[PDB]
Design a binder for this molecule. Structure first.
Ligand SMILES: [Mg+2]
Ligand SMILES: [Mg+2]
Ligand SMILES: [Mg+2]
Ligand SMILES: [Mg+2]
Ligand SMILES: [Mg+2]
Ligand SMILES: [Mg+2]
Ligand SMILES: [Mg+2]
Ligand SMILES: [Mg+2]
Ligand SMILES: [Mg+2]
Ligand SMILES: [Mg+2]
Ligand SMILES: [Mg+2]
Ligand SMILES: [Mg+2]
Ligand SMILES: [Mg+2]
Ligand SMILES: [Mg+2]
Ligand SMILES: [Mg+2]
Ligand SMILES: [Mg+2]
Ligand SMILES: [Mg+2]
Ligand SMILES: [Mg+2]
Ligand SMILES: [Mg+2]
Ligand SMILES: [Mg+2]
Ligand SMILES: [Mg+2]
Ligand SMILES: [Mg+2]
Ligand SMILES: [Mg+2]
Ligand SMILES: [Mg+2]
Ligand SMILES: [Mg+2]
Lengths: 184, 258, 160, 142
RNA sequence: GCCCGUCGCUAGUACCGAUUGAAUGGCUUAGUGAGGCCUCAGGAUCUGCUAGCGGA
RNA sequence: UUUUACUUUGAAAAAAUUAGAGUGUUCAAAGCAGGCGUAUUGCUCGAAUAUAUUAGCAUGGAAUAAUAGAAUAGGACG
RNA sequence: UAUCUGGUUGAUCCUGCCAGUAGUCAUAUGCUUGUCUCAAAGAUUAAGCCAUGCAUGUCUAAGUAUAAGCAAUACAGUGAAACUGCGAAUGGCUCAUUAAAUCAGUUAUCGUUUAUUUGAUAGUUCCCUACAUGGUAUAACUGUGGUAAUUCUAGAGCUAAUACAUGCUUAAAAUCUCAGAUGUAUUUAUUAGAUUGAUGAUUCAUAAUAACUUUUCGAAUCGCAUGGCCUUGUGCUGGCGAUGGUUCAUUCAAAUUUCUGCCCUAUCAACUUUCGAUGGUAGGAUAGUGGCCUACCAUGGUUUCAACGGGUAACGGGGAAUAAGGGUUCGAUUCCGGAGAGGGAGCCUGAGAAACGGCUACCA
RNA sequence: GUGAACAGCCUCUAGUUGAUAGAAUAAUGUAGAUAAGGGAAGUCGGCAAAAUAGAUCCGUAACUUCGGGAUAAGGAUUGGC
């Protein structure tokens, strides 16, 4: 199968290497999961040592963390809008680490209302204790009017079977919005 | 090559076993266990070649099957159980106890000890780590883990192990002027006091040992075993106490019995 | 002699790479798979013998259908299996009327009763109690060891 | 490093979060480590903006192997240099020596500035490319 | 005295040589491409739950 | 407390093999044996040592051979 | 044991080779061959082809026994077959490929997997069984067969588990959310991890918060003794073990890996880079690092200090022969490492195989 | 317009619709074509015909007067949106 050895991949001097030690199992590779969206389908791969990997194909929900307040709500993934490695993954809506996706944002809005009560996008003094330092950001909150949050996938869906991630903020959000407005 | 090896050809066994060259094709491969493969001493070797109690491996197995042998408090019915440094071999029949220590020539000497001190053992602290749930523990030279150690116990120290409750009763620290055993290298089996420890960050730490005869030799930190303070060993030293007499003096001592 | 396969759905025989938990193949080694030729599912003139299962008996008995009838070779072995066999309730202490048999070899006819599995026995109860007591005893020992280690840490932190 | 954010992905030190809620001073929190073995983390590494996940100070690599010294013969790669390590090989039969050399590809952090010459010290790290197994840890641009 | 070369015979060795010679092996463009593996599906019949709904 | 080469010492370089200590295989090649008083309810010596010097490691030296300091002083100590 | 001698001449002194001479665990072969010890042995040519037979099976007290198998009120002993578990990845053989490849010495894993051994380690499980759940399970067994033929197996009737799948009991104490949760396993994010542990060094060990899981682990197991207390009951407690189990450590290992060192050849001087060559970013894949693979980007990387190419009747080394010293030649072969099982390629199981006395296809 | 194009094909302005006609559809002809399997066995001879063909990318030998041979040979792609 796919081999990760350096017996092929000719040497740094350019010399072609002769073939010894016909392909070894401990050097094997496997095919990409190419995680799609919707109708969760996770397969178990028996890996070395008797361990187990989870090839997530067609993942619909993931655990996304705000990271400004530490909520990490489970949400639905809408689609892929940006991918630094290949625009084809955006076109095919392929879930993978570091992919920029859109998430539902309704659990985050509900948590924000039940925690601060400050009408983000439209037990009495707990909100008073969570005092006027409650504005999140003019770019993290403007997405709530549309009910879609830009997030970066942090897990490896083809490796762990999960599609967790975090909501972009600050300079990362500014960079990714600049990329989006440059490519669209 | 496709998996772990299970045979041990003769002339590939550690030379400190002093195995016969032409006894057979194979040597007793030390099973997995506490100490090592090279630094170990199989019970079959200790019983058929060091004590001569058993004549064959079948007789070694017969001895082991009736719970006669006991390593560090447990029966250890394994024919090739890797007994090693500071391990206590006790046989209830023929009741005497041996602490497996290194003679001056680096072999595992037959060193009879008494029951009143076969209870405990010494162990070099290989590592000090925080385990699950924030519980600190120490890993010793014989693969023992001991939870909740003294907060002053560091690496290269020695810990007395009860070997009945399996807990730390006392600990010696690594410092200049402490009695140390050499557990590997050219000076394997020597006993002396620490003169100085050169650090060599990144590389290997070196320690200078001075025997009672004022001979000073340097050795790697990996194979030094603190056994107490000078003149007060926490264990019973072997017949030669790691002196490393020169060959001429050895010949003189041999010829002093006529 | 090639057996019919359950769902091949062909009038002839074809070669398939067969697996552990399938018919027409018994693996000789764990993970072994063999390419064997088996016959299709739909019957045709090629078959030497067919096998049928009677699901409805309509009319006059065949001379080898009901008059020649053989009994079940083994009675139920598990306790709850015997309970379901004889309709008994839970609290019925099923060790008395377990099916038995006689071996007439030396005019002794010593009965050969089966063993019963999952039988509720005081040995199993003692094992469970010992396991639970071990769990609680190690839990208590770890708690007290942690307490005394905390005491040692505080006593050594008092020297500032 | 000349508009560091020049890649398609966002360049940032992993798991180093800069909270936009708190009103901190620098607002550009930068992680760094001590490379060890007496190798002083440079001020460019301290105060820079580059990411260089392969940096021995601000990256996820560690210097844990051999410490070699060599002369830089090529700086034409991106954050990678080639050093020439000259030595004398002894031929016993003639009781003499012959000049030999082995080029070593070394990753150079943007903290250091390296040109042709510039005898550098490199420390072994994990494989970070097909050929590179060493990270520059001391520049000694002399 | 010693001696050199052509030519002629015998024997041996190697060379050039039309035959777009022949055979073997390595590498390789292009084309076809078995087989297992991953994957999009597919549903024999197999059994559970209330015509339906899950699982293999 | 520039950078090296070089050289001393030490750890290292599996065992077997080699050289080599001891030892009446009857001698020897070999082997790691064995030896000593009895009518035991047994005492004990050994299976050393040297060799690899390529390369790496630790360390003393600073001759020999190379390398750089301060010259448009952008120099050294407060 | 730092040795020479014969041969060019009519004679001489040289150069110079031929020849002699001695050794060879260095191969044949001829003649000869009484004794004791020791014992290489289809490597060279053909890693050419193979008839036949054997070379991997395995049961304790302690997984499953109704053999209609043996023996003098459940079997309790022995024990066929079978299920289950483990092993079959060790060993042994050969040297075909392989020239920076293997290998040797020496490093690293702060870059990973690790059955087994040894040590330590889990009071947190549930939204009408635990004095213990199901067949949704079946083998052997019984009976009916097919095939000329194979370690081919079909239909039918049972039957169990440490097989398969579910599934509780552990109070007590404990901190947050607004009565619930907080064990552990997985994933992500965040925080502490100082000068409250360690390293030369870490985003380390570990802990905490918020959450997430086609959902893990948290013995529904077995043997021998049965003891104690008491309301003497299907009462309540309590031994030694065996097996299994999550995690950590250890051991056996494995996989990559630092530096330096390989024979002849220029009648091989440029090589690599379209089809990855050198590096960067990101992803995928892997057990994990890594152009290992992909997308984008840059034009790099090696070389007269011999790259690249070609040859090897080249596996490398420990070592062997011969040797004043220096060297020369050999090493298929008793040990270590590698590779292969006619040539390739692919893969299942398994901790560990790209296994071949395992499978699949192609080629012969 | 298509197309590299004053190529071929269709069209605009302009011009022509002028060639003796009608009915049938035999052979043999003239001109244009197709053809199973084989593939030059036909024939003096591949005559005739067929095959190839544009463009883009790859790749290109002997020989050579070093300029060529060369579109050598031999391959892949081509539409629409
Ligand atoms: Mg001669
Ligand atoms: Mg042969
Ligand atoms: Mg083997
Ligand atoms: Mg961590
Ligand atoms: Mg990467
Ligand atoms: Mg050789
Ligand atoms: Mg060869
Ligand atoms: Mg060899
Ligand atoms: Mg050969
Ligand atoms: Mg071998
Ligand atoms: Mg193999
Ligand atoms: Mg063969
Ligand atoms: Mg194979
Ligand atoms: Mg075979
Ligand atoms: Mg085999
Ligand atoms: Mg045009
Ligand atoms: Mg035709
Ligand atoms: Mg045709
Ligand atoms: Mg043709
Ligand atoms: Mg003709
Ligand atoms: Mg003709
Ligand atoms: Mg003719
Ligand atoms: Mg023509
Ligand atoms: Mg052409
Ligand atoms: Mg031509």
């Amino acid at each position: 199968g796919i081999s990760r050895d350096s017996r092929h991949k000719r040497s740094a001097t350019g010399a072609k290497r002769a073939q010894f030690r016909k392909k070894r199992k401990f050097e094997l590779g496997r095919q990409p999961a190419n995680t799609k969206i919707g109708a969760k389908r996770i397969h178990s791969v028996r890996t070395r040592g008797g361990n187990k990997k989870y090839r997530a194909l067609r993942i619909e929900t993931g655990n996304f963390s705000w990271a400004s307040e530490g909520i990490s709500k489970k949400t639905r993934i809408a689609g892929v809008v940006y991918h630094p490695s290949n625009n084809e993954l955006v076109r095919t809506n392929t879930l993978t680490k570091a992919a920029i996706v859109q998430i539902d944002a309704t659990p985050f809005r509900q948590w924000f209302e039940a925690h601060y009560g400050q009408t983000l996008g439209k037990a009495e003094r707990k909100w008073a204790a969570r005092a006027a330092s409650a504005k999140i950001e003019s770019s993290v909150e403007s997405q709530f009017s549309a009910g879609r949050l830009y997030a970066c996938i942090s897990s490896r869906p083809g490796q762990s079977g999960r599609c967790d991630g975090y909501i972009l903020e600050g300079e990362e959000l500014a960079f990714y919005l600049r990329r989006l407005t440059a490519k669209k | 090559a496709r998996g772990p090896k299970k045979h041990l050809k003769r002339l590939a066994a550690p030379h400190h076993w002093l195995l016969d060259k032409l006894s057979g094709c194979y040597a007793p491969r030390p099973s997995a266990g506490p100490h090592k493969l090279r630094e170990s001493l199989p019970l079959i070797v200790f019983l058929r070649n060091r004590l001569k109690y058993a004549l064959n491996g079948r007789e070694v197995k017969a001895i082991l099957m009736q719970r006669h042998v006991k390593v560090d408090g447990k029966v250890r019915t394994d024919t090739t159980y890797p007994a090693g440094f500071m391990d206590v071999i006790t046989l209830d029949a023929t009741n005497e106890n041996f602490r497996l220590v290194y003679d001056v020539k680096g072999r595992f000497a037959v060193h009879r000890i008494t029951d009143e001190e076969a209870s405990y053992k010494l162990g070099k602290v290989k590592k000090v780590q925080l385990g699950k749930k924030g519980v600190p523990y120490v890993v010793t030279h014989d693969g023992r883990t001991i939870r909740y150690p003294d907060p002053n116990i560091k690496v290269n120290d020695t810990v007395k192990i009860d070997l009945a409750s399996g807990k730390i009763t006392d600990f010696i620290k690594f410092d200049a002027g402490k009695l140390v055993y050499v557990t590997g290298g050219r000076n394997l089996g020597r006993i002396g006091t620490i003169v100085h420890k050169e650090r060599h960050d990144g590389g290997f730490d070196l320690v200078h040992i001075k025997d009672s005869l004022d001979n000073t030799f340097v050795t790697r930190l990996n194979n030094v075993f603190v056994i107490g303070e000078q003149g007060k060993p926490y264990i019973s030293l072997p017949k030669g106490k790691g002196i490393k007499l020169s060959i001429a003096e050895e010949r003189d001592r041999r010829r002093a019995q006529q | 002699g090639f057996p019919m396969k359950q769902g091949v759905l062909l009038p002839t025989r074809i070669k398939l790479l067969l697996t552990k938990n399938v018919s027409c193949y018994r693996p000789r080694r764990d993970g072994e798979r063999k390419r064997k030729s088996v016959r299709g599912a739909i019957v045709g003139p090629d078959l030497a013998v067919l096998a049928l299962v009677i699901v409805k008996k309509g009319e006059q008995e065949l001379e080898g259908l009901t008059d020649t009838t053989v009994p079940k070779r083994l009675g139920p072995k598990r306790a709850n299996n015997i309970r379901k066999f004889f309709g008994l309730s839970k609290e019925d202490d099923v060790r008395d009327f377990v099916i038995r048999r006689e071996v007439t070899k030396g005019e002794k006819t010593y009965t050969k009763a089966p063993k019963i599995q999952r039988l509720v026995t005081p040995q199993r109860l003692q094992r469970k109690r010992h396991q639970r007591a071990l769990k609680v005893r190690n839990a208590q020992a770890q708690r007290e060891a942690a307490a005394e280690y905390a005491q040692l840490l505080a006593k050594r932190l008092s020297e500032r | 490093e000349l508009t560091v954010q020049s890649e398609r992905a966002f360049q940032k030190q992993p798991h180093i979060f800069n909270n936009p809620k708190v009103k901190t001073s620098k607002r550009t929190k930068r992680w760094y480590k001590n490379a060890g073995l007496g190798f002083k983390t440079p001020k460019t590494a301290i105060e820079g903006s580059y990411i260089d996940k392969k940096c021995p100070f601000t990256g996820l690599v560690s210097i844990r192997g051999k410490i070699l010294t060599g002369t830089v013969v090529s700086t034409k790669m991106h954050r990678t240099i080639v050093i020439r390590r000259a030595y004398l090989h002894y031929i016993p039969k003639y009781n003499r020596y012959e000049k030999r050399h082995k080029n070593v590809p070394v990753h150079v952090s943007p903290a250091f500035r390296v040109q042709v010459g510039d005898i550098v010290t490199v420390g072994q790290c994990r494989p970070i490319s097909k050929t590179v197994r060493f990270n520059v840890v001391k520049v000694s641009a002399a």
